[PDB]
């Protein structure tokens, strides 16, 4: 006999200070929290790619459905939501021709081919940025189903390419926007969106609005002075080692009033292979920069900050970590993991636990159904039963319930996508996302340090 | 003093829509009598529509669709909806919007063939910006607008 | 397949007239179609004049008069006429029949 | 009295100048109408216009263009207004406007 206490679902802040528990029917009933004019879009790709982003830019302006209007709610098209125009009028093309598409992908060389294709399309995005007289917001890279099938490479180069720059990019598939006619030989379309169609437009259209400068919603309980950190750690396969660790970092604080959340980066790098541990000076100049992040958006130092992470910290990081801060900023860090198979099924057998139940195993360790069964959408995240994250409190001194629920709360603020939460705390995704990035190109001079550019 | 506007659409296919705009008029300021909102139910309707279709709606919204164009109960509104108009002479009563694209202009029932429709074939925001416009300049009655009303009716309901 | 004559009036202002061709054109071996026949009553009309507008009839007579220019049921049957006249590609379709002295062209 | 202007254009393809026009007559002092702007949701179109046309039309203003040539709406509007005309005697009532070089003369 073992217990189960609930941990209930945090609210997510929609324009006019309207709570809400889920991004789509917020969005579609209150909207984002600012306003932009609109959107500016330049398209890359030849003129099938424009053709067929020109008709799903039109086909998204109307209200669109989905089979069940319950578990997925419906996009009521992009003006609607986001009272901002995103036309095909405001488009700015750059013809790429087939004949140039091949005569690079036509090589025998498999790095060679992608640094030429990408080399191009920058090259080309890079001509029309510094002396065209448009103004574009975000650039939509529309490519055929004969680049990417054959470059794996080609997004993270694209991305890293680009950041001493800093457009923001969105690398689109033929098929993902033209699902409907790119079926397979035998006319099986590969890719069925005729369910979904309408959770395809709310992700597109929010990941379009949020590359554009636009803040499409925000936490609305969360505790002024405290930071978290997400700490992840990649592996350089290009550099002179087969293997060289690089740690990345993901900054979330709250603001002066609100919803700061940009990431503190500049992979730190471990040269021996397997030791996922930052040295002392490297924790130094992590802890450091993230301090001064904060400290100079706020004014004062946080009283509170979380590094959460993947791993456990050892004595050595972690005395490095306590020599660097003052002493009223009280250091926690906790290690998140995936390694517990604690299947916990039910004993009804129609559907899978709830989200947000939690098995406290002592006053350092506990276990969390972050994806589980949300009842407001009458289905589960998963569809076998779901695998919790097993958090213990590594070091420091903190509530195990003030850490749940601030899981739960990170578990919230994903842009990339339009879904009623995600499964793991965004600090980390968003970390990760930045550390595979950020080496995909070993020579990269102070980055951007916004996502919209990852 | 009537200031209620009255919806009426087919149940159940239309009901993304008229969810979307009741909860987007409710959120400015309006008051809006559609029997999706009273959907608890247990109690007859019928005397009741009737009663605040002649008693309090000041503009009777049709939610006009491929759908809603025979449907039996919609029909029966349109005539209570012309009989309160001609009783109140109020040539501006009854206001349909078209909705489905599929329903051509050619084939829309007798009772609104005659009267200018607003659009919501194209956009959803562009249809509800003309019907927040003909509403102030035909002077609908509204209270300053509230998110919060609309937001503890679709936690309520 | 259509053969009936829809005939429009205003009632009961225009009926002396309405009722004299109805009956001539019945004895003429036309099949016409007005309500002051289907007088035997008992059922909703609006939508059984719409789909006989719509479904059936091959000439709508319209009966034009001080009476029938702005009566509201003239005009809803005329705005549907109009529609239907649209859809069978057909001009000749509306036929008015002006009647009364004191409506001038 | 008659103080309004109306313009009959073709909906939507003359949209464009017909805007700039009504906007550039309001901004001189000069009332103006077209469905463009003061035409209402639901009205009974077709009676409104046909009401504005013969109450209180001073000027008709017809766009002609290749689109507007044969537009059944505007030869209807035209019609009423040579009706309005030869009631008032006034030769310069109704003023075509000439914007599509590709409309002959």
Redesign the interface.
Known sequence: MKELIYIEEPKILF??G???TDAR?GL???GPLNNLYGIKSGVIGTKQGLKIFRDYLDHI???I?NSN?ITRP?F??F??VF?CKWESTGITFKEVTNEDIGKFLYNSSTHKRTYDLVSLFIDKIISANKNEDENVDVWFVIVPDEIYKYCRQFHDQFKARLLKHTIPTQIFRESTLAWRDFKNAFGLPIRDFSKIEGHLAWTISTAAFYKAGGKPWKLSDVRNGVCYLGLVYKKVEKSKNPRNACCAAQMFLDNGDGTVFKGEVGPWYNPKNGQYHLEPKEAKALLSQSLQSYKEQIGEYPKEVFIHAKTRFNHQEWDAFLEVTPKETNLVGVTISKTKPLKLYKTEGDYTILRGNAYVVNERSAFLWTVGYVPKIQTALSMEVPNPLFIEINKGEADIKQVLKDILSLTKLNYNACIFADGEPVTLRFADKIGEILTASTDIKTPPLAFKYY | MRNKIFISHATPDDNDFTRWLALKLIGLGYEVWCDILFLDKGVDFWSNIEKVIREDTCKFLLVSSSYSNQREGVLKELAVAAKVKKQLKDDKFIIPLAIDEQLSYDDINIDIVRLNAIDFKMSWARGLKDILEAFEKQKVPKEVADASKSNLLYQQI
């Open positions: 324009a006019h309207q709570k809400c029917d579609a009933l209150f302006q109307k209200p459905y209007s419906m009521p098209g003006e609607a009272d």
